[PDB]
Amino acid sequence: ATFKVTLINEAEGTKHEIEVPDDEYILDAAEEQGYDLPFSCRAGACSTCAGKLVSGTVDQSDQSFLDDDKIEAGYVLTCVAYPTSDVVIQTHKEEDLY
């Protein structure tokens, strides 16, 4: 399967739509498709690539930085997140954790 992923940058008021395979991390797909997103560790151990889900679901089982509450609040580490449905997500949300 291939899911549609809508990336929203509220601060800049931009929107990008990309198609991501069910076995590819969002970050990777976005880059390949021409959209650079913030990142640092690239390994699910930091908050640089944080995004916030608006709708849809993902699988970010490889992540380790986010606690359960953050997860419940909809936060996602885009560098290790696989879409499990069509998703709409807000990017550049790191600030939200401080």
Map residue 28 onto helix, strand or coil.
Answer: helix
User: 41 labelled as ligand-binding?
Assistant: yes
What is the DSSP secondary structure assignment for residue 25, as one 8-state letter?
A: -
The residues, any chain, with a CB within 8 Å of residue 72's CB and separated by 6 or more, are none
The reply on whether position 89 binds ligand FES by CB under 6 A is no
The reply on whether position 45 binds ligand FES by CB under 6 A is yes
Min dist CB 8 to ligand FES, Å, is 18
Min dist CB 36 to ligand FES, Å, is 13
CA atoms 27, 28, 29, 32: torsion sign: positive
Which one of 6, 39, 71, 88 is in contact with ligand FES (CB under 6 A)? Answer: 39
Count Cα atoms within 13 angstroms, Cβ side, for 94: 12
Write out the binding residues for [2Fe-2S] cluster.
41, 46, 49, 79
Residues at the contact surface with ligand FES, assessed by CB under 6 A: 39-42, 44-46, 48-49, 65, 77, 79
